Structures are given as structure tokens and as C-alpha cells.
Amino acid sequence: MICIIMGSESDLKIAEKAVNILKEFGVEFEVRVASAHRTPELVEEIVKNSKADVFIAIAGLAAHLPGVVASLTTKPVIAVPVDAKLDGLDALLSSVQMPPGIPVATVGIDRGENAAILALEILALKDENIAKKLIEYREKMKKKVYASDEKVKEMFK
Amino acid sequence: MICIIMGSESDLKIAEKAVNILKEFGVEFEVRVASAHRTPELVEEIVKNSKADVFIAIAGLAAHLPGVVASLTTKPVIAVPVDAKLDGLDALLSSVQMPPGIPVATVGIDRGENAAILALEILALKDENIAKKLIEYREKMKKKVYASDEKVKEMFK
Amino acid sequence: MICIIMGSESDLKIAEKAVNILKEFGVEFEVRVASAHRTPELVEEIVKNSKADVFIAIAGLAAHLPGVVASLTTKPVIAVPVDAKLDGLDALLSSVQMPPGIPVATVGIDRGENAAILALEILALKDENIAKKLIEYREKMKKKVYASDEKVKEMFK
Amino acid sequence: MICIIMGSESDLKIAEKAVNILKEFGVEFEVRVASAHRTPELVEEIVKNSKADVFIAIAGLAAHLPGVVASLTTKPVIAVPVDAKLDGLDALLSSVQMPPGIPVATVGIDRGENAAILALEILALKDENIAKKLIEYREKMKKKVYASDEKVKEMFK
Amino acid sequence: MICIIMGSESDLKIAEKAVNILKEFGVEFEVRVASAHRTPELVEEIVKNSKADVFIAIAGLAAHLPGVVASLTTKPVIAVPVDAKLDGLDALLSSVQMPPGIPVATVGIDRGENAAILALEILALKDENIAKKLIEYREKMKKKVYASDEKVKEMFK
Amino acid sequence: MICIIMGSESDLKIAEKAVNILKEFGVEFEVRVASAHRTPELVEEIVKNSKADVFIAIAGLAAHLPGVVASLTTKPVIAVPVDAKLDGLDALLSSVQMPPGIPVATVGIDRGENAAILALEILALKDENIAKKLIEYREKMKKKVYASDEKVKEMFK
Amino acid sequence: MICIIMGSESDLKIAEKAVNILKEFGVEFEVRVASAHRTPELVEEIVKNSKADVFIAIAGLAAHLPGVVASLTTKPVIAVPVDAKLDGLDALLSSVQMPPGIPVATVGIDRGENAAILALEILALKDENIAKKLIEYREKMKKKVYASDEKVKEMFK
Amino acid sequence: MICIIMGSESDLKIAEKAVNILKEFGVEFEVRVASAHRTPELVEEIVKNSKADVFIAIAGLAAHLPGVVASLTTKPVIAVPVDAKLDGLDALLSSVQMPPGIPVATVGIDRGENAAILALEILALKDENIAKKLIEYREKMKKKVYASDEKVKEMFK
Secondary structure (H helix, E strand, C coil): CEEEEECCHHHHHHHHHHHHHHHHCCCCEEEEECCCCCCHHHHHHHHHHCCCCEEEEEEECCCCHHHHHHCCCCCCEEEEEECCCHHHHHHHHHHHCCCCCCCCEECCCCCHHHHHHHHHHHHCCCCHHHHHHHHHHHHHHHHHHHHHHHHHHCCCC | CEEEEECCHHHHHHHHHHHHHHHHCCCCEEEEECCCCCCHHHHHHHHHHCCCCEEEEEEECCCCHHHHHHCCCCCCEEEEEECCCHHHHHHHHHHHCCCCCCCCEECCCCCHHHHHHHHHHHHCCCCHHHHHHHHHHHHHHHHHHHHHHHHHHCCCC | CEEEEECCHHHHHHHHHHHHHHHHCCCCEEEEECCCCCCHHHHHHHHHHCCCCEEEEEEECCCCHHHHHHCCCCCCEEEEEECCCHHHHHHHHHHHCCCCCCCCEECCCCCHHHHHHHHHHHHCCCCHHHHHHHHHHHHHHHHHHHHHHHHHHCCCC | CEEEEECCHHHHHHHHHHHHHHHHCCCCEEEEECCCCCCHHHHHHHHHHCCCCEEEEEEECCCCHHHHHHCCCCCCEEEEEECCCHHHHHHHHHHHCCCCCCCCEECCCCCHHHHHHHHHHHHCCCCHHHHHHHHHHHHHHHHHHHHHHHHHHCCCC | CEEEEECCHHHHHHHHHHHHHHHHCCCCEEEEECCCCCCHHHHHHHHHHCCCCEEEEEEECCCCHHHHHHCCCCCCEEEEEECCCHHHHHHHHHHHCCCCCCCCEECCCCCHHHHHHHHHHHHCCCCHHHHHHHHHHHHHHHHHHHHHHHHHHCCCC | CEEEEECCHHHHHHHHHHHHHHHHCCCCEEEEECCCCCCHHHHHHHHHHCCCCEEEEEEECCCCHHHHHHCCCCCCEEEEEECCCHHHHHHHHHHHCCCCCCCCEECCCCCHHHHHHHHHHHHCCCCHHHHHHHHHHHHHHHHHHHHHHHHHHCCCC | CEEEEECCHHHHHHHHHHHHHHHHCCCCEEEEECCCCCCHHHHHHHHHHCCCCEEEEEEECCCCHHHHHHCCCCCCEEEEEECCCHHHHHHHHHHHCCCCCCCCEECCCCCHHHHHHHHHHHHCCCCHHHHHHHHHHHHHHHHHHHHHHHHHHCCCC | CEEEEECCHHHHHHHHHHHHHHHHCCCCEEEEECCCCCCHHHHHHHHHHCCCCEEEEEEECCCCHHHHHHCCCCCCEEEEEECCCHHHHHHHHHHHCCCCCCCCEECCCCCHHHHHHHHHHHHCCCCHHHHHHHHHHHHHHHHHHHHHHHHHHCCCC
């Protein structure tokens, strides 16, 4: 089980990048909306009662959701910085620069897909079905690259 | 009453800048240490039971203390970004870029003194003794500037 | 009474975010346009004769309005950095990095709404009607978040 | 098993922060030095034959080690940006901004301790002994904070 | 022979800027697509067997292609940072800040044309036909500038 | 006489901002196009033979025109950084950070109008007709501000 | 006459760089200390009654002195950003990014010497004795460079 | 032949990093000092008469030396940004962001060693003795890495 928490409905586009990946691997997950600032009790309640092995927090601006989620559990918390101002430099450092003792796994700005893959790599350590799918997923990717090469090769001759 | 909360004992130097100002104006205040990440329940407990009209939160790195304090009260929360990495650019945006609805008054990096003055200006709206002291404080400052001018004037002639 | 001063008519969009909030709380306020550079005497005149307990200064670029307003009064001065160039990094530091003795409460870039809320939180210390409205305002916000959660919950099942 | 790889012996100080944490939890680990640029075959060889469930890559400058390690395994790869120039802004984005499909869990600059904790949180999903230790570790941390509060409380009275 | 390698088909626009220059000088070249992260074996294979005297690597984000290409050959490797996020500041430092011993010639962001010219200047050291064309190319450029001057001169009179 | 030099015809929009100001003050000026990189001999020739008391150089990217112009004369050289990449941060520092001995007066990015005004303020020191016009120009500006205030005043009542 | 105004006695080191240059050219000047924030009436008074043809304002942090000085006169105002925080990026943009109509000539951070030279180049337009000295000053500089070349030439042979 | 040009004697430390590399490969080279701003005629004269196949320009601040050198020759010009202010961000973009047609090969800040290696890789295309030495140089480097690994391996057991 993977729990995806959006600090705002504005993070839906990035959150769906994650969901579409999780749906392709056939894994269980939940998608929630909860503000660390506006509804601290909803976040707390979602986290403390979740059965998720991995949390994916998605927020922009002075993104404090990832940090708040991590302070409520010892499960791995992945943060996805969303660019809503200053081209994502706010949400990036606001979530990556956590203090000693309470870490947060940070991925690139708007990288919901990489957040889902990271979460699957963590689960794959216990679920061999997921590990196998990860290897196949990489193969699929090499193949798209070969196809790009083949196509471009026919371009400027 | 003014409540000063440090996210870490590393913020003491900046926190004392604030205290020394509050001591010169003869006003009531409290100085506490509480981590938004490590001890969310201590922060919550300090804020929800404080009698302070103004909160001064001082933290560095991915400073989330100011934000967490503001989400627990409707009283004015002043944040003081502390430079512990990336010359304070982290704690700055992490506290200033709050989301709509839950604001935080931000002052310059390591500006504990300006945080105390801002807090006094807020109290002065209800305490005429403080308002008077603020005006006198400004006069004192102009005088130090005149003295600098007088001194420099005698320098390169 | 709250006094909103725009350094330019270009700041109207951000200034209206503030006004709409003040109108919802039913509080007195004034909206003015005055340049710190082009009309220093109008700014001076507006500030020195205002009956406002809180000043909200809104300017972009090398925003010096907040600083100039604060140097003319001991009342709390809230600055709203407007992004007109360099994605608001100019107006941000130009108003937040004030020197010791003359502080300015800074909120996020284009955050006129947060500027109005901050101003109300200050007034609420003396006006219980405003304090009550602030608490209700927060409740309203939690409710919009719950509604977002409920809606998103029905999305990917 | 956790595999720590340093791109340079210059990363030892940060690498030891990690080791000291792993030693306190009594977990198996390896510490290696391998350059992604100078010895790509050593990195490849270390990764492809490691029995580690989690990789911790530590490099500075145009840090490409984390990325190269992640491209060689599907196991979680944690990157620790080291500040050797431009106050760590190079190694930060160079490792965090990975492309879709090949993610890297990034922690703060020089945060070797947070890298080890993150790795343990991942292992804890399969090792209950580690999960228990994580909870105890957090308790220990709250206690240091309470002690800081108690101490500071006796300071300005 | 010059070998142009794109880390992604998204770099085609910038890659064509290079090709169009190489086509005007009548020199041999190859255009390939290969990901340093997704297909490390294709990159390795392309580089180790290329007969190119100069390599032009074009990638965005945490661009690691230039670095990986340079670690596989002693031939000059020119990197072209592509702006796909953070206005190209990622790919810039990620390729320019190489470590001692394995250098990479970096040109401006999206400067595929300057990458091709740089490559020709290198070849010109051995091919006098190219050296001559470079001098003629510069003359052509001065002429476009004179024409701009002549045109603008007739503008505001 | 004022000499405006554009490093590229791409700087025309910003250059016209300057011209329109100079035309309103009725002063003599020249508008030229010359590249510091592509046509160093045209720049040299224009500068060494100009009768201008003030030079206005307008260039973007790694703007070296201002610097090159200043190294060819002892007359005041005003630089106007043009944002063509990295939101003007390149051309800004590339022209402002001159080395001791050869200064360049720098104005804001794309501020051709401020460049013309600065040039007129310099000429006004010798031409009383220009000095008078500068004072009138400022009056005109205060008046536009008063009109903005009057208009906005009628807005939210 | 040239008027140098320091916003703080902390700017003395940079201010002396300017004075030493002015003393070598044998020109009249004044050195003053006046805060735009703390003593707006002293700044106003100094500027409105100065007989200076050129003003050199030196301030750090959210440097507003240059802007305030320029709003009080039509004489050329040169700003010298002082690095007291964020390596001078605050004072730089805070003074360079002036709004249309009220320009400020900006030189590099801590470049008091370049500020004095710029001021002399302006005066030289009316004082031929200064113009001559500027040309001689440049000759002296070329000579120090030749001497560096001669010395280095004997170094690695 | 390789020509190293320093814009200032302040660049000696970085320039020697280059020389020491060139001395180890036993190749011909010259070390000169010439300012693009202060002595444009010395730079011009050095470049136009040099027999060097590769130019290495080393300058800090608003580094314009690399650009000026490249505008005087069609030979490859390598720039080494020197950090003398703003941690090298000035000299970096000032030399890397060249305009179309006149490229400059840029290496990391203070990377004189990488500048020399890049220059040798260019010469190696015509000198097989240098090509061979480059391959040996890389072997030597792998060996230092293996030695670091061996040493660290014995450290925490």
C-alpha cells in the first residue's frame, strides 16, 4: 500500500503522474488531499492510521506537507516539489533541507512519476512481483530510446 | 506577553538578539525550545496554551517552525530565518512563502532584533507605554547616526 | 482602520486580493497609490496623517515603498512583494532585508490575501469581533480542504 | 545490508556521519570509494554484485555518482549532495533532477546522517528490529529537545 | 567526423541547430539518441566505437550525458545544456562542474550552433579546408552586423 | 550628443525606449548596431570617433558590449542588460561586475528609458536647458501618480 | 564637488576606497553618514543643500539609500552595493532595479573605487583637468599590467 | 603550443594548476598577463601573433577575457571562471553565455587543471604522443581511486 497525499487540489496534475504509474504496476494505493497548514488534524489522522509502507507527499510553495508527514511516521516519505512560484525552488529546498533525524526522500520538481517508481523500488524489496516488474519497466524504457535512435538516424541523411 | 520559540538551541545567538530588545522595553516574554519535526506535541502544547499576543519563531534550514506555529494560532507569528546553510535562502523562502489563509510575518535573516521590534509595534497598538518607548527608541537611533556622521566628518579632512 | 498603499497602479490585481478579504471581514480600510521614488511627499503625507493601526505596502521591482512607509511610522507595516521582473526576487529581498530598528513584516510574493489576514490578526488583538471572524475563517478553510479530499477520493477508484 | 559509495575520499567526513548512525543501529554495511567519471568499471562492479537493499551515494560538484548508481540497479539509491563549490547547489540539482524512470532519493546537503536514517526506514519495512529501533531513536531525539527547553528556560529569568 | 548524441528526442530542436551548421561546412557527422540513465550500454557502445574526433552531447535536466560520454573517451566532448526546467541552470552546472581529470567543454544553454562551431574550430587544426571556412564564416557574420547597422541608421532620423 | 550602441538588432525594443525619451527632450543622439564579438573593429571605430559625451550600450546574454565600449573611452558608459536568457541575470552581472579602473554605469534590465534619463542627468550638468527639462519631467511623473491615486480612490468605495 | 553618503559606518572600508581615488585626482568632496530608514530628514537635508554635481551612495542589505538620494535630486546618483549578507545580492538588485523615471548608476559590489572613477568621468565632461587625469590614470593602469606580464613571463621558464 | 592568458596576477594560483599539468605532459606553452579592459592592445597583440593551437583564458568577476580572446582568433579558446566574488557565478555566465558564432569552451570554476587537460585532448588529435599520455594519465587516476577504496575499506571494520 502506498499513500499519496496532496496539500492542494492544485497538485492533481502531478499527483496523477504518480497514480498512472501505480496503476500500471497493479499496486494498492490511496489518494488524499490534506493541508499541513489548514488541516493539520486531517494529515495527522491520515498518517497515523494509514497501512501504507510508503508515503508520497505532493505540495508546492513553502511546501511543509512532506516534513509534517515524515514527523508523524517512521515509514519512508517521498516528497514531490511542485512549481507554483519561483520555478519550484521554494518547495524544493523547503522539503529537501530537512533537519537531522527526520529525513524525507526528495525527487525532482513535478516528478510524480519518479516518486511512484521510487516507492515501488522500496516495496520491491519485499514484493518480488514488483521487483520483476521494475526490471521489465526498465527494459521497456531502453526500447523507447532505441526507437528514438532508429528514428533520428533516418532524419538527416 | 510575547512567546519566542527556537526550533533548536543553535538559534540561541539570534534568539538573544530578540530577548535583549524585549528586556530594554521592560516587557513580559518567554523563551522556549521546541522542534516542529522532532517534538510536534511540545510545539502544539506551547502554542495552544500560551497567553502571548505575538509569537516569534526562530529556525534554520527547511524552517517549518514558523509555519507550524501559525497553523496552531490566529495570533501574529513572526518568523526569523536563520542561516545554517545556503546563506539562509532555505529558511527564508520556507517561512515567507506560506499559502493563502495562514500568513507569517517574515523579517530578514538572523534579524532577531527586528523581530522583537515588530512584536513591540504590534503590542504598542494596545499598550501606550510601549508606543511611547518605540518613538523614543527611534530617536535614540537617529542620534547614533548623527554621531556617526559627526565622527566621519572629522575623518578625511 | 487599515491603510493599503500601492506604489503603482500595476499592483492593483494584488491589491484587490487584499481588499476582497477586508470586505469579507467588514473592516474599515483605505486604498491609495503613491510612489516612494516619484512622489515621496504624497507617501509621507498619507502615512503621517493616517489613522490606520496597520499599513499594507504593495510594490514591485526594487520595492522601496514598504521600507519608506515603515520609516515614517511605528505602526506595523506589511510588505507584499510583486513579481514584475526576476520572478519577484527583487521586491522580496528589497523589502524583507530591512536594517535593525526599522522592521517590515513580509509575506509571500503576490500574497495580498495573506497580507490582509495578517493585518486582521493584528487588529484582532484589540477587536474581539475580528478575532472571532478569524477563527470562523479558518474553519471555512478546513471545510474546503475536506471537500477537496472527498472529491479526489471518488476520482481514481 | 546497506552500501555506501563515496565518489571521492573528500566525502569521508559526510560518509562517517552515515556510518556512525548505522553502527548505532547495529546493521550491516559496506563503505566504498569509486568515481563515476574516473572508474566507471569499479562503480558498475560494486553495484552489480552488491547484496545491499539500499545504496547511499555521496559525491560533490557535478555529482553524477548517485545517477550512475541508480542506472545500474533497481534498489533504492539515496544521494547525499556534498558542498565543495557553490555551497552545494551543484551536487544538489545534479542528483535530484533525475529524468523520468530512474529516480534517486535525495536528502539535504551534507546530510549523511539523514541518508542513513532514510536507509534504515526502508529496511525497517522488512526488519522489525530496525523498525523498533527507529521509534526509540525518535524518542531519544524528543528528549534532547526537552532538555534544551529545560536548559534555555533557566537562561533569561 | 563529429558525433552528436542526444539524451532525448526532446533535444532535437537544439540538435538541429548543430546539424544545420555542420551541413553548411560540408563535414561528416552522425546524430544519435542515447540515454546515460536508461541505456548506458548504448552510449558506451556508440562512444567506444565512434571514429569521431569530437563529441557533442546534448541533454537537459540533471544532464549526465556529457559527463558519461567524456568518461568513455579522451576525445574532446562538448556539452550543450538544454533548458527543460529551472531555465537551464540544472543542465548547466551538471555538465560544467566536472571533476579534475575528466573535462567537458561547455557552451551556453541551447547553443547547438556554438557547439558545432567549437567542434569545427577543433577540426580546423588538422583540416585547412575547415580553417578557411571558419574565417569566411566570421566575415559573413560581420556583414550581417553591418547590414543591421545600416538598416537601424535609417530608422530614427 | 549621446551615442546608443546595440550589440544586436534584437535589442531594438529596449533601444527605442531610450530613443523615445531622448526625442522628448529634444537632444542630439545616434543609434548604432555593433557586436563586441562579431565586429570589434566597428565598435572601436564608432567609439573612438564619436563626439558623444555619454555612451549607452545595450546588449543581452554574456553582454560584453558595455565593457568593451568603456575600455575604449573615458566618457561615461551606461549599460542596459537585456533579458534574452536566464531572465537577464547574465547580462546584468556581466556588465555590472566590471574590474577596478574601468567602470560602467548599470541600470535595471530592459530599462532603456532609465538609461536615457541617466544620460540626460549627466548632460544637464553642462546644459541648463536639459536640467530644467529634467525637473519638469519629474513634475509630470508626480502628476501621473496623483491621477492614479485619484482614480483608485473612487474604486472600492 | 562630489558627495559620498554612507548609510552606515559599516560602509567605511568601501567608502575609503572611493575617497583615496578622489584624493589622488585632487578633487573636492564630502563624506557623510545618513540612514534612509533611521534618519530620512538628514539624508533629505544633505541632498537638497549639496552643491555636488555627483552623488555616491554606499549601503548594504536592503539598500534603499541610493534610491532615496536619487528621488531627492536630478544629479547623477551612483550606488555602491555593499555585501553584508547574501554575498551582496540584496543591495545589488535593491539599488539597480529602480523604476522608470528615477535612475541610479550602479557599479559592482564593494566597488568604491569604480564609483569614484565613474564620478570623475562625469565631472571630466566639464573639467578638462580631470579628463586629462583620467587618460593618465588609464596609462598608469596599462603599465601595472605590462609589469605583471613581464614578471609572470620570468616565472615558469 | 598552448597559450595561457591571465586577466590578472590574481589568477596565478588557478593558472599554475594548468601549468603543472602541461609540464607533466612535456608540452610547449606560454603564460601571459593581459587585461581585456585595461590593455586591449596587449591581448590583441598576443593573440594575433600567437602560434598556439589552443588558448586558455583565465579571469574572474565580469570575466570578458575569454570572449575577447575568442573574438580575435578561430582557434579553440578555453575559459576558466575564477571565483573572486559571488562564488564565481559572475565569471561563469559571463564567459559561458557567448553569442552564436563566437563560442568559448568553458570548464568549471577554478578548474585550471581541467582546462589544461581539455587543451591536451585537442592537441592529441594531431599529436599521437599526447594521445598516448592522456590514456596513461587516466590509468594513473583510476589507480589513485582504487588506492582510496583499499584504504577506506580498512577504515570502519
